[PDB]
Design a protein around this ligand. Structure first.
Ligand SMILES: NC(=O)C1=CN([C@@H]2O[C@H](COP(=O)(O)OP(=O)(O)OC[C@H]3O[C@@H](n4cnc5c(N)ncnc54)[C@H](OP(=O)(O)O)[C@@H]3O)[C@@H](O)[C@H]2O)C=CC1
Lengths: 71, 1001, 217, 145, 49, 96, 48
């Protein structure tokens, strides 16, 4: 809840089809920069390159959707 | 006034924007061909953008076929469509897969009070001098003016302007720097200083104006924005904020208070014009001064689709609704101002107080809802507002309470301070002083400008800024800088009131002097003679083009190729329906309103007006005369006297019992068999009837003879069977009926026949006679000067046809009412075509009668064309007819075929709104009454008679579906008229080519 | 709920209570006639209210399972109309459903909730025409109380004054008819007055609901 | 409604339209109601008014066209009167109880007068014109008396 | 069934109007038999049908 | 009113909006109809309205803040309406 | 009209709400932390 904006109990109890995270006020903004910190390094032959997992989450994104067919 | 109006089944969602762009583009297609709209018009630019907002892959393929098919040789307008059209096919392919955009285009207007020399005041909204844009309105609002001192291609080329629509404007001259130092803009946001007041901030307002400029160049987007807005009636700000929400893709609830058909046809027309791709629109009925509706509407929005709600969320709530208070001062503050304190203040707090309990339950705290409160600058400064001032002042306290209470995460307040919007129901009463208040430097806004200024409070620059601190938008043109706004208000009025009188009463005297110095009869020849129109009801035959013009349409090889004996042709047609004949139905169908020649026919149909010749009160008269009171009515006044009553009693309406022999739909009589439990009173009867009771009841009833009178006395004993009537409230209350007062006597049908024949044949004889009138046949025996007698067919049957003479036989003999002795004759389906041959045509052609039970008339055309092509008939009637009665209507009701009527009142539907083909919430059909026939004929003989050829029936077919166990279930059996073989689609058949068939001939 | 669902399906198909197995579904019973299918849903949407998500496809042993959670010991709306029209067309004169409950209790020893089920067994096996004799009605009801016991599994002086108090009650009407006095004018003024009481409560409790009990008090 | 839209789309698709030429679907039962004998004739009088005038009238109760009906790209559903410059042929489809369906098609009358010759056409025009004036006189007199 | 047995309020079918038409005896010839798509033009002659 | 916030604004705060605001307006609105009848226009009545400094600044006042803010509008309406001779407003802002 | 503002300077304190709950939560806790400590040293005193 406090870092990514979803509750894991509601996912298990009643299996959703889609889950749009919303990025609202201060709490929402705090949550979004936890999605903006998804860069993985590999110490490239003496370098450091980070690729963001979540592509479109930028400083203007008000939401993000997780999608699935069944659940 | 507190009484509830909301319900869950009275919502109307509007979601078919994928078809109001194929409609709106083809509506722009012919208004450029025929010359309605031209290259100058900014509305075509406005209608360009409402199609660029709705761009699918299927829509460009619609556009590409219609522009590539128009032929430029014929006209100059045909070249014009292909210039704009290929320019708009250019633009839609770039905005495809791009979110839609609100961009208001039209000319920003201004006020003008002009007083005529006769002393009449007129307020006219005039296009302004140096502000021809919304991009010029932005640079005006950033300059301020004199009183704030403290600290294109459009009208000359649409097709160039239409090209400049996808392209986003690239600038760097920032309008924040266009603000003069020591000059407040006209549109400034505010900031609370730590002393506690709200003062003008440069940087907050500069972030507002700069994004407001981009809102004029590029425009706002509102995709996935969910908005509540109340108080959105016609001609107010809430209707112009609505157009800017729907245009950008928002998903908007709009609540109305006066829920009608007029209101719901207006909200359909808004969405059929502005609603972009993905936008939606809900109209729910509403009360805001009711506590139980603000509870019940916020439930219905957030609640899920499994339980009937919407399942939505909300990202803006705009509670604008207000009632007028005027002339109401502090001693006259009463229940009207106390009902209106609750609309504008303490139920706005329960909208903001009840969306938070919907986000508390669902745990939603990362999606605020920006509240947009309408505020005022004048708190007590006008005269008797009532309690308008008190309500507005209270709203300002919310800014502080966002910091201090627990609802800062669900709601964010954004108070707007709307200036002089003129036209809206609060400030439309004084438009005449708006021109004088602008003489200072104060600015007034039309509604599309405070639409523009409030939709700048939803841009993603200021939406983020609301979520840090409250946002106060002061949108006055400097209307807080005029000293004594009340004193200067009445000063401008009393000058323009007196000049409107002193220029009026002076001009009325110099015309009274002028008729004394020179008299009346010297100037009596200086008035003119006007003329009122008369009604000239025409038959509307087809207008024939010259033979040079005709062969330009048809191919050149058709001449001599085509045998005219075996081409079938409609020669006449007529009908009788709920809107009278075929002529007064087309005026209601095509136009929605009657002409002057249709109010005259619909009054002659329903028997309102009535031709008088002779003397009226001694002096001679010739003209239309009311048939009730025998007093004259002019054709100029047939409308205003009778347009109400003709629209009351024609069309789909409530079932009127006088038309259907005492049938009340609400009281449907039924008899229930009971058993007597003791013996009844002796009633006296005649000899033959009391012997009939004894043969029936046997040993139960008791008949005895009365000695003096000679008539028997009948006693019932315990164990006999009675039939006591009951009555069943029945659901189906509405049917489309031939208008109230349609008499067959007014067409010339005698009482020898009306009293003897079925009511459905009176529908047919009027429809056969009027069909020769449309055919030029004035004497039905003119058909025999050319055709033999045994070559005039009559192939025209009904679905049920004679329902009124089946209850004469199954229901009125059993009741033993006085019935005719030949009712079985008049009940057949082939006997409505007997009175067409007994009272009319005396021919000996075929009389093949169809029955289709809902398709009786396309089958009848099929039997017709098949009859003529074999030469069995050279003329034949075709047509179909059916009568509406009580018992057929009840039995379609048990089949769930016709629609229930009490379900429809619960949805808020009106009777002129319940027959709806291809609709999302259609429910069944609406059973109607009447007839309709056509007279077909060879195309060889139609040229030799000299008759109006109205059409060419190229094809007629019928088809049966397949195996099943359900009769009313339709099927695709008539899909076998397109049957051809596609094994060999390589090379063109010469047989379908027409030059080849000419060479063989 | 198995005892009520089995009757209302067997009425709409107009077949016996044994010729329809409850292991089958609604769809395999009709034949394809979709006029009948809407009639089966409407009779069950009225009767129980809670209608499942796939009624037309689920077998009837699984649908009485669903209906049992929200049905207990009631008669209902659809069920009380089919059982009063049963007596009003197939039972003799003076033999109302009150007499059809006095007979099932006195002779067969059946209280109120049991004999609500005896009438349901008598609904699907209704006569083809009206029973004529007064005892042929009782022979019909004796025959159905044992066809009800094969479903549940349960084995089973004041008339000298009723024909007297008839005479005093019928003498009373003929004196009241002679005096032209209305013995029911009290009740008709009564019954048309609880309308106006309940109408005012509808108006008055509307305002304690709108304004609140704190404001009004 | 679903069946009629589906049948029209299927036939047009099979025969080879152009993609982007949908037939415009007029509806008349919104205003008069659905009769059952008179149904195909009221649709037949309507067609010969849409042919000669070139006016496409509109279902003025289609507040929201159904979402299922978007899969038929060869139909269009209007809600307002749409006066065109020429309608060449109109379809008239009537579906009945007892699996009684059927369609007609009604070509413009000016395609008849291309197979005619100029002696014949001029002669015909005069006769029709005389008939038109005569019929008009007859209709007014009867109406009034 | 429709003019006389509803007024008596006997138990009648709910789709008797279907089965009363003249073009529905030719529906059960296409529903229980032949499954064709040819013309279904129905005559009425009242003694010469 | 205490513990009452914007989602718990209910009939108790709606009964009390009427005590503190829109029946104070009917005291000042009904003494003027008593001086209108008797023709008394040379004897004003100084109204003493209790105001507050905290309009929303505390926590859940209920609607105490709304009632107080509305009273401040009267100062302007003395200049603009017709009751300036019978009533004179004197708003006091009482502290702690 | 006459507007009397009779505050002792209570419009010059920034964040009157924040400073209100600050003074209370100190005097509430000191009323408890001086209470529960004194209740334990009397429970120790009856054990030793
Ligand atoms: N216009 C101006 O000059 C300014 C206005 N304001 C405020 O902005 C808003 C602007 O409204 P405006 O459009 O100008 O005024 P209007 O009166 O035109 O619009 C208000 C809407 O409220 C609806 N309404 C009326 N009574 C009720 C009720 N009892 N329950 C529910 N709804 C009702 C009406 O339409 P319907 O019932 O058809 O929906 C009406 O159009 C108002 O709140 C006003 O106080 C602020 C500053 C300037």
């Amino acid at each position: 809840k406090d870092t990514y904006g979803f509750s894991i109990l509601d996912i298990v109890i009643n299996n959703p089809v889609n889950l749009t995270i919303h990025f609202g006020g201060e709490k929402g903004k705090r949550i979004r920069e936890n999605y903006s910190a998804m860069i993985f390094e590999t110490i490239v032959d003496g370098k450091l390159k980070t690729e963001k997992i979540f592509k479109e989450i930028n400083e203007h994104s008000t939401s993000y959707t997780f999608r699935s067919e069944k659940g | 006034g507190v009484a509830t109006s909301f319900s869950r089944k009275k919502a109307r969602t509007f979601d078919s924007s994928w078809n109001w762009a194929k409609q709106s583009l083809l509506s722009l297609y012919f208004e450029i061909i025929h010359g309605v709209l031209k290259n100058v018009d900014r509305e075509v630019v406005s209608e360009a953008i409402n199609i660029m907002n709705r761009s699918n892959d299927a829509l460009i393929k619609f556009m590409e076929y219609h522009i590539s098919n128009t032929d430029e040789t014929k006209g100059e307008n045909y070249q014009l469509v292909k210039t704009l059209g290929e320019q708009l096919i250019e633009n839609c392919k770039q905005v495809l897969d791009v979110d839609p955009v609100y961009k208001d285009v039209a000319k920003p207007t201004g006020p003008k009070t002009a007083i005529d020399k006769n002393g009449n005041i007129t307020y006219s909204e005039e296009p302004r001098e140096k502000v021809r844009k919304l991009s010029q309105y932005v640079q005006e609002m950033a300059l301020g003016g004199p009183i704030t001192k403290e600290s294109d291609a459009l009208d000359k080329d649409s097709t160039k302007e239409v090209a400049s629509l996808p392209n986003k404007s690239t600038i760097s001259k920032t309008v924040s720097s266009t603000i003069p130092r020591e000059t407040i803009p006209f549109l400034h946001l505010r900031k609370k200083t730590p002393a506690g007041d709200w003062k003008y901030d440069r940087q907050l307002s500069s972030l507002f104006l700069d994004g407001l400029e981009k809102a004029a160049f590029n425009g706002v987007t509102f995709k996935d924005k969910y908005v509540l807005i109340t108080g959105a009636g016609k001609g107010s700000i809430g209707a112009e904020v609505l157009q800017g929400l729907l245009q950008g893709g928002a998903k908007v609830v709009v609540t109305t208070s006066r829920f009608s058909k007029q209101v719901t046809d207006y909200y359909q027309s808004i969405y059929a014009k502005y609603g972009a791709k993905g936008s939606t629109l809900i109209v729910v009925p509403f009360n805001q001064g009711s506590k139980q509706d603000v509870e019940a509407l916020i439930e219905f929005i957030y609640d899920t689709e499994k339980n009937g709600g919407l399942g939505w969320d909300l990202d803006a709530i705009i509670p604008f609704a207000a009632i007028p208070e005027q002339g109401i001062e502090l001693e006259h503050i009463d229940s009207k101002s106390e009902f209106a304190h609750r609309i504008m203040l303490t139920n706005i707090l329960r909208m903001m107080g009840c969306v938070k309990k919907q986000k508390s339950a669902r745990g939603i705290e990362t999606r605020p809802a920006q509240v947009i409160l309408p505020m005022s600058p004048n708190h007590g400064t006008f005269g008797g507002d009532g309690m308008y001032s008190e309500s507005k002042l209270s709203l300002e306290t919310l800014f502080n309470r966002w910091h201090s209470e627990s609802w800062a995460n669900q709601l964010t307040v954004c108070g707007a301070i709307i200036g002089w919007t003129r036209g809206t129901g609060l400030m439309s009463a004084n438009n005449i002083i708006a021109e004088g208040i602008e003489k200072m430097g104060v600015r007034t806004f039309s509604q599309k400008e405070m639409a523009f200024n409030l939709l700048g409070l939803l841009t993603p620059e200021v939406v983020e800024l609301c979520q840090k601190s409250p946002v106060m938008a002061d949108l006055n043109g400097g209307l807080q800088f005029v000293p004594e706004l009340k004193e200067f208000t009445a000063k401008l009025r009393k000058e323009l009131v007196e000049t409107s009188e002193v220029r009026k009463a002076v001009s009325i005297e110099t015309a009274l002097e002028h008729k004394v110095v020179n008299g009346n009869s010297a100037d009596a020849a200086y008035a003119q003679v006007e003329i009122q129109p008369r009604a000239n009801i025409q038959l509307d035959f087809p207008e024939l083009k010259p033979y040079k013009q005709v062969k330009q349409i048809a191919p050149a090889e058709l001449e001599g190729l085509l045998d005219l004996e075996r081409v079938i042709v409609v020669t006449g047609f007529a009908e009788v329906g709920p809107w009278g004949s075929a002529r007064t139905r087309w005026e209601m169908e095509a136009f929605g309103e009657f002409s002057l020649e249709g109010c005259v026919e619909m009054a002659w149909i329903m028997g309102f007006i009535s031709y008088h010749n002779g003397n009226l009160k001694g002096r001679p008269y010739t003209g239309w005369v009311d048939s009730k009171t025998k007093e004259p009515v002019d054709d100029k006044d047939v409308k205003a006297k009778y347009e109400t009553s003709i629209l009351e009693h024609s069309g789909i309406r409530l079932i009127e019992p006088e038309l259907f022999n005492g049938y009340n739909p609400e009281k449907k009589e039924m008899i229930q068999e009971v058993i007597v439990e003791e013996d009844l009173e002796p009633f006296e009867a005649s000899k033959e009837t009391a012997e009939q009771f004894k043969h029936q009841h046997g040993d139960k009833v008791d008949i005895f003879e009365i000695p003096e009178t000679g008539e028997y006395s009948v006693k019932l004993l315990k164990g006999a069977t009675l039939y006591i009537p009951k009555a069943l409230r029945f659901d189906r209350l509405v049917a489309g009926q031939i208008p109230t007062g349609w008499n067959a006597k007014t067409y010339g049908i005698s009482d020898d026949i009306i009293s003897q024949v079925d009511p459905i044949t009176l529908f047919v004889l009027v429809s056969v006679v009027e069909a020769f009138i449309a055919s030029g046949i004035t004497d039905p025996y003119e058909m025999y000067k050319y055709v033999h007698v045994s070559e005039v067919g009559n192939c025209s049957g009904s679905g049920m046809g004679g329902v009124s003479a089946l209850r004469g036989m199954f229901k009125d003999r059993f009741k033993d009412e006085p019935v005719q002795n030949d009712i079985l004759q008049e009940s057949f389906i082939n006997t409505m075509s007997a009175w067409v041959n007994m009272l009319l045509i005396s021919s000996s052609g075929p009389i093949k009668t169809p029955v289709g039970a809902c398709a009786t008339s396309v089958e009848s055309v099929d039997i017709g064309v098949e009859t003529i092509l074999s030469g069995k008939a050279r003329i034949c009637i075709v047509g179909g007819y059916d009568d509406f009665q009580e018992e057929g209507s009840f039995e379609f009701g048990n089949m769930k075929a016709t629609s229930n009527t009490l379900e429809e009142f619960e949805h808020g539907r009106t009777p002129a709104e319940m027959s709806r083909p291809a609709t999302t919430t259609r429910n069944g059909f609406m059973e109607a009454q009447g007839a309709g026939i056509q007279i077909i004929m060879q195309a060889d003989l139609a040229l030799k008679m000299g008759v109006p050829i109205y059409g060419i029936v190229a094809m007629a077919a019928t088809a049966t579906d397949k195996i099943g166990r359900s009769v009313p279930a339709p099927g695709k059996g008539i899909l076998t008229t397109a049957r051809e073989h596609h094994s060999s689609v390589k090379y063109a058949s010469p047989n379908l080519n027409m030059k080849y068939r000419k060479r063989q001939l | 709920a198995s005892l009520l669902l089995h009757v209302l399906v067997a009425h709409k198909l107009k077949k016996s209570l044994d010729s329809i197995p409850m292991s089958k579904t609604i769809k395999d019973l009709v034949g394809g006639k979709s006029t009948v299918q809407n009639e089966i849903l409407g009779d069950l949407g009225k009767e129980f209210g809670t209608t499942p998500e796939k009624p037309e496809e689920t077998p009837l042993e699984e649908l009485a399972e669903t209906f049992q959670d929200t049905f207990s010991g009631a008669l209902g709306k659809q069920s009380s109309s089919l059982l009063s029209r049963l007596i009003s067309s197939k039972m003799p004169g003076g033999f109302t459903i009150t007499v059809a409950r006095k007979y099932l209790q006195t002779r067969w020893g059946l209280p109120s909730g049991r004999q609500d089920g005896v009438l349901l067994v008598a609904l699907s096996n209704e006569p083809a025409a009206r029973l004529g004799s007064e005892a042929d009605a009782k022979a019909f009801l004796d025959s159905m109380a044992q066809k009800y016991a094969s479903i549940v599994g349960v084995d089973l002086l004041e008339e000298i004054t009723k024909d007297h108090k008839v005479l005093a009650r019928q003498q009373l009407q003929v004196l009241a008819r002679y005096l032209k006095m209305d013995l029911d004018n009290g009740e008709r003024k009564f019954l048309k007055e609880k309308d106006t009481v309940a109408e005012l409560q509808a108006q008055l409790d509307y305002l304690n609901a709108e304004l609140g009990e704190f404001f009004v008090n | 409604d679903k069946n009629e839209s589906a049948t029209i789309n299927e036939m047009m698709k099979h025969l080879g339209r152009s993609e982007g030429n949908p037939v415009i679907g007029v509806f008349q039962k919104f205003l008069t109601g659905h009769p059952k004998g008179a149904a195909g004739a009221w649709m037949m009088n309507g067609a010969l008014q849409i042919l000669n005038s070139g006016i496409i009238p509109g279902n003025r109760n289609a507040d929201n066209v159904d979402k299922i009906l978007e899969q038929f790209e060869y139909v269009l559903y209007p809600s307002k009167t749409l006066k065109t410059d020429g309608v060449r042929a109109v379809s008239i489809t009537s579906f009945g109880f007892g699996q009684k369906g059927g369609q007609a098609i009604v070509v413009h009358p000016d395609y008849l007068y291309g197979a005619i010759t100029e002696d014949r056409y001029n002669e015909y025009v005069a006769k029709v014109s005389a008939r038109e004036k005569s019929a008009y006189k007859f209709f007014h007199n009867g109406m009034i008396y």
